[PDB]
Ligand binder design. Structure first.
Ligand SMILES: [K+]
Ligand SMILES: [K+]
Ligand SMILES: [K+]
Ligand SMILES: [Mg+2]
Ligand SMILES: [Mg+2]
Ligand SMILES: [Mg+2]
Ligand SMILES: [Mg+2]
Ligand SMILES: [Mg+2]
Ligand SMILES: [Mg+2]
Ligand SMILES: [Mg+2]
Ligand SMILES: [Mg+2]
Ligand SMILES: [Mg+2]
Ligand SMILES: [Mg+2]
Ligand SMILES: [Mg+2]
Ligand SMILES: [Mg+2]
Ligand SMILES: [Mg+2]
Ligand SMILES: [Mg+2]
Ligand SMILES: [Mg+2]
Ligand SMILES: [Mg+2]
Ligand SMILES: [Mg+2]
Ligand SMILES: [Mg+2]
Ligand SMILES: [Mg+2]
Ligand SMILES: [Zn+2]
Ligand SMILES: [Zn+2]
Lengths: 97, 91, 63, 97, 212, 127, 25, 202
RNA sequence: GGUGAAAUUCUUGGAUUUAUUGAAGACUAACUACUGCGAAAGCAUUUGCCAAGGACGUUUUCAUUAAUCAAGAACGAAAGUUAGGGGAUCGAAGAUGAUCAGAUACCGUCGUAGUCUUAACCAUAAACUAUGCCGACUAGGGAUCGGGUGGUGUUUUUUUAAUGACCCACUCGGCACCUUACGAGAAAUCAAAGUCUUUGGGUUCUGGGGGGAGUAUGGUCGCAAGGCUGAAACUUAAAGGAAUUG
RNA sequence: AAGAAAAUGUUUU
């Protein structure tokens, strides 16, 4: 599932948590995938999709809200969007859709 | 310390109005004064205004709900019934 | 009232609470490839012609 | 004393078996304890299979059968002679006739 | 004192357009009058006819077909496919002890607009050399078999209209497809499509009904 | 070549119904019962009453224009009996014998995929 | 007496005793 | 004020003039601020949308239902109440519905209603617990509180007044044909006493 | 309609029956078994998610970490309690019909509470296998569920094979069962209720004639119903278990 | 297929 891939990404790869750093990565062109929490506001979701299509970046929609995304990424705070910068030894980039 | 054994919030009513009435009022007052998770921002910041109005201190969004709880059991079953009927209509 | 007769081809046994009735399989004289089971009150033996007011009622045992 | 070595039922390793209702009196009896008989009678015997065959519009109709599982309570089974009181040695014979 | 059968008139239920035989029978309905029309009294009637009578072959003695009067043309009631079911005798005959009964049901929309629920049934069976007397499945076989049957039914519809699915049910090609796809999972003697239920129909589209 | 109706023999205890309808079931022809054929308040379910009722149903059907009936036999069903009454066989035999043609007999007793609570209490009728 | 109804009668008697002692002081 | 249900202020665009029309709906529960409300025959079956009664499926739960098309809401307006659509008659286009009192009502299928239940439900489940709370409840509704008992008045003041003991003296069940000044007590009561039995008579 | 027979009851404002739709709530038939899982109470529609669990396999790891357990806890059918929701069915109370010598009992027609659920209580059942748990040993047998191993096996197509199902043999663990009892028992019976006067593997709980009595009293828990703990005075020669003949 | 009613019997030997 996505929880195992995300956990392996946290423990091995590179990631950034939060809207501002995610947009920074997208506009730097150095993000591989962005995972958006289900309860993210739709305007923010659409802007992230616009940034991702401009940077030719893949978007995955997490089934949980920000609380569930924070738990999945292994943090004790809510996470609205995750940007995978390096996948590490994880198949999250390729095992999509 | 624990200041009361069982009255809880209804310790403000003293010995008046009867134990059973104070018990009912305790349950509904705790229910109406609790903080609830916001379905939009994901924070436990939804508090009641007047009866039936539940506003999130964060993101300033307010939802119509039950008088003393954010969502009633009637609300859950009506939402489910409308979802079922809507899905049948659309497919 | 239609008049129909049959002939007893087998005597099945005594029935009724007091054993007064006799169970007989009877073959209809007309259209002889037809047998029905009937309840009879009097003493019955084989090759005896019974007269039937009604033709179609499979007689069940009298408990 | 204990009349039946296992019990008057068939339940070991369960604790609870959902009840069924007797077809004759509607008494609640555990399904494992209920006396179950299958009735597979032809839909029309009536000493009249030949009558239905002659009256039928189809050649070689192959008239159907009616299937019915009947559950009896102990009292109803004994009164209706579905099962009979047996000698002490005969009780231990589970083989059907 | 009234004898209402004098004011009834007979209509021919020209029920199918593709099954084998357009004639299923006749029905009666009260004569059209000033304030009550026979076409209104009809046009909702469901006639359920045996597929054996509708195909002329007795190997369809089960699988009754439901046919709804949809439009009236001059004493002829043109119907359309409304649903299909096994007979109780066949269902109870297939359901036996000392074997596992596997049931699958899907809700899928046909090619044009038709929404259907398909109920398929299967029964575990012993092998030819089997000595064990019950031949049950391990319920992971049941889950896999149900998954396969659901996928098969969902594929067979959505590539078929109501008419194509109706012409597909009669030769029972779905049953042999289930047998081919689950034979490597567990034996499954008695695979059948026991029921087709029509949940929602599109706009009445008399043009589409006029396939006869 | 034949004009077909539906027989709809509902054979409970305490009564039997012989209900010939059209192939659709909307239009009904000569629904008749053993309660209308006998007056004893106990014999309503008797096979003789069922036979007389079926004879009357077949007569009126042959007057209306029905020549054959597809037979649908049922018990009370639901939660109660599942066993067809004493009158169903008599009604079916009488319809067969009265000149009507017979077709496609089916047992359509309403059988729950599971039931509401059956009447009688958990101890049942105690007689 | 059936033991179930013996228990029920004892329970009724016990409640009656509590009521009588409670009326007393 | 004086209303248990919260109100929803919903802004629509004027279709014929360039301006906004603000409407005061009764807030259905689940409706939030910033939510889009869709009103019309082609509106979706989502909570808070306003649809004609004939345009919703069987068993739909609606609120603020019109008795006549265009009266802008008459039925199921108190908090927690709703109307169920129990059937349609497209010919002679009508809708059979279940009202909060349990009455069956036939309404023109073009009469509108809001999908969902009125917010603020469960309001009357809390004991008022205080004459002060009843005072404040009725201070914003009307001058109907507190209420003096008729048996506690004088014969001049009420039918029930007078007597050396407080008692009605005659039956308090009052005929439907009684006149103003006589209708004190139980008007045209089909029965009295503690309700033992089932309601919703066939 | 209902019944052994009836009657209450509904019915030409069309009952019962039919057909067509629709809704509500409950429930999960058949398959369903001397079959499975769980500590027990219990658990039976599909699918998804979430954690959990036994057995097996292991030339994996730690190394005595363990057994049973006052006090102390968690869970604990049904009924019942409090507040919502829901209230189709059945249905303590109640209303009635009938039977009767009486019959506000059985039987019939309704029907409140309840039945379902949510959030809290309650903590009891013939909560049973009336059989504590852990460990070792002591007959024979065939089935069956889960896992594993092997076969010149059969079948299934993929293309060689291989998984699947089945067959054979073994094995570990489980629900049980058949015979015989070396053995035990008062017997019924028991592979444990055996390895007990040839009495000792470890450990917890309970009983000491029948009533009075699970009563009184005190304490404690519960909103309550009640739960847990729990006597005595006095009374009594049997009460009781299993089996035998009538 | 099934079949309504049926209460009571002093003490000791
Ligand atoms: K007065
Ligand atoms: K109820
Ligand atoms: K003496
Ligand atoms: Mg005994
Ligand atoms: Mg138990
Ligand atoms: Mg009658
Ligand atoms: Mg008896
Ligand atoms: Mg007042
Ligand atoms: Mg006053
Ligand atoms: Mg005064
Ligand atoms: Mg007066
Ligand atoms: Mg006056
Ligand atoms: Mg005075
Ligand atoms: Mg009618
Ligand atoms: Mg099932
Ligand atoms: Mg199983
Ligand atoms: Mg303890
Ligand atoms: Mg309860
Ligand atoms: Mg106990
Ligand atoms: Mg003692
Ligand atoms: Mg004895
Ligand atoms: Mg004596
Ligand atoms: Zn918020
Ligand atoms: Zn019974």
């Amino acid at each position: 599932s996505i929880n195992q891939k995300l956990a392996l990404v946290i423990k091995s790869g590179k990631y950034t948590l939060g809207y501002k750093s995610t947009v920074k990565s997208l506009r730097q062109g150095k993000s591989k995938l962005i995972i958006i929490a289900a309860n993210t506001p739709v305007l923010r979701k659409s802007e992230l999709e616009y940034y991702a299509m401009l940077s030719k970046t893949k978007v995955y929609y997490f089934q949980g809200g920000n609380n569930e995304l924070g738990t999945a990424v292994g943090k004790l705070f809510r996470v609205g969007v995750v940007s995978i910068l390096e996948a590490g030894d994880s198949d999250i980039l390729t095992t999509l859709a | 310390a624990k200041r009361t054994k069982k009255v809880g919030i209804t310790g403000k009513y003293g010995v008046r109005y009867g134990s059973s009435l104070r018990r009912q009022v305790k349950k509904l007052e705790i229910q109406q004064h609790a903080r609830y998770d916001c379905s939009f921002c994901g924070k436990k910041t939804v508090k009641r205004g007047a009866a039936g109005i539940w506003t999130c201190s964060c993101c300033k969004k307010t939802v119509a709900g039950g008088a003393y709880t954010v969502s009633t059991a009637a609300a859950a079953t009506v939402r489910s019934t409308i979802r079922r009927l809507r899905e049948m209509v659309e497919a | 009232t239609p008049v129909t007769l049959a002939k007893v081809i087998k005597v099945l046994g005594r029935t009724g609470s007091r054993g007064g009735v006799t169970q007989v399989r009877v073959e209809f004289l007309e259209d002889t490839s037809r047998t029905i089971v009937r309840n009879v009150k009097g003493p019955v033996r084989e090759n005896d012609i019974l007269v039937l007011m009604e033709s179609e009622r499979e007689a069940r045992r009298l408990r | 004393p204990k009349k039946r070595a296992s019990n008057g039922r068939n339940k070991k390793g369960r604790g609870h078996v959902k009840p069924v209702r007797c077809v004759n009196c509607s008494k609640s009896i555990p399904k494992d304890k209920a006396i179950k008989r299958m009735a597979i009678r032809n839909i029309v015997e009536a000493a009249a299979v030949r009558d239905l065959s002659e009256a039928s519009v189809y050649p070689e109709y192959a008239l159907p059968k009616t299937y019915n599982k009947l559950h009896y309570c102990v009292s109803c089974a004994i009164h209706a002679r579905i099962v009979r009181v047996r000698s002490r040695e005969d009780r231990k014979n589970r083989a059907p006739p | 004192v009234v004898d209402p059968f004098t004011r009834k008139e007979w209509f021919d239920i020209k029920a199918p357009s593709t099954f084998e035989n357009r004639n299923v029978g006749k029905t009666l309905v009260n004569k059209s009058t000033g304030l009550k029309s026979a076409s209104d009294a009809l046009k909702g009637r469901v006639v359920e006819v045996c597929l054996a009578d509708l195909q002329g072959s007795e190997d369809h003695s089960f699988r009754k077909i439901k046919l709804r009067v949809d439009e009236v043309q001059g004493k002829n009631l043109l119907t359309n496919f409304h649903g299909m079911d096994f007979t109780t005798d066949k269902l109870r005959s297939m359901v036996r002890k000392w074997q596992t009964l596997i049931e699958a049901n899907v809700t899928v929309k046909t090619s044009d607009d038709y929404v259907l629920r398909i109920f398929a049934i299967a029964f575990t069976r012993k092998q030819a050399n089997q000595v064990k007397r019950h031949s049950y499945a391990q319920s992971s076989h049941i889950r896999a078999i149900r998954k396969v049957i659901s996928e098969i039914l969902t594929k067979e519809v959505q590539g078929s209209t109501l008419a194509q699915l109706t012409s597909k049910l009669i030769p029972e090609v779905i049953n042999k497809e289930i047998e081919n796809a689950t034979k490597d999972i567990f034996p499954l003697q008695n695979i059948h499509v026991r029921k087709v239920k029509l949940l929602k129909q599109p706009k009445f589209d008399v043009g589409a009904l006029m396939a006869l | 070549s034949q004009v077909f109706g539906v027989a709809r023999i509902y054979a409970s205890f305490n009564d039997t119904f012989v209900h010939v309808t059209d192939l659709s079931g909307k239009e009904t022809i000569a629904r008749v019962t053993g309660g209308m054929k006998v007056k004893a308040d106990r014999d309503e379910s008797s096979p003789y009453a069922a036979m007389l009722a079926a004879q009357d149903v077949a007569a009126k059907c042959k007057e209306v224009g029905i020549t054959a009936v597809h037979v649908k036999i049922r018990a009370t069903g639901g939660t109660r009996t599942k066993t067809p009454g004493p009158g169903g066989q008599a009604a079916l035999r009488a319809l067969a014998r009265s000149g009507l043609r017979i077709g496609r007999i089916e047992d359509v007793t309403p059988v729950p995929s599971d039931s509401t609570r059956k009447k009688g209490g958990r101890r049942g009728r105690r007689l | 007496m059936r033991a179930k109804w013996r228990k029920k009668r004892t329970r009724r008697l016990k409640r009656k005793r509590r009521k009588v002692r409670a009326r007393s002081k | 004020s004086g209303r248990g249900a919260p109100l929803a202020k919903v802004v629509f665009r004027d279709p014929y003039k360039y301006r906004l029309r603000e409407e005061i709906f009764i807030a259905n529960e689940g409706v939030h601020t910033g939510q889009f409300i869709y009103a019309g025959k082609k509106a979706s079956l989502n909570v808070g949308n306003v649809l004609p009664l004939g345009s919703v499926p069987e068993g739909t739960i609606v609120s603020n239902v019109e008795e006549k098309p265009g009266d802008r809401g008459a039925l199921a307006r108190a908090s927690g109440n709703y109307v169920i659509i129990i059937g349609h008659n497209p010919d002679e286009n009508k809708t059979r519905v279940r009202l909060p009192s349990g009455a069956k009502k036939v309404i023109s299928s073009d009469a509108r209603g809001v999908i969902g239940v009125i917010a603020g439900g469960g309001r009357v489940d809390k004991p008022l617990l205080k004459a002060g709370r009843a005072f404040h409840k009725y201070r914003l509704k009307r001058n109907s509180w507190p209420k003096t008992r008729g048996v506690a008045m004088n014969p001049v003041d009420h039918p029930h007044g007078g007597g050396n003991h407080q008692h009605i003296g005659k039956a308090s069940t009052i005929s439907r044909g009684a006149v103003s000044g006589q209708k004190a007590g139980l008007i045209a009561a089909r029965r009295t006493g503690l309700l033992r039995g089932s309601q919703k008579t066939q």
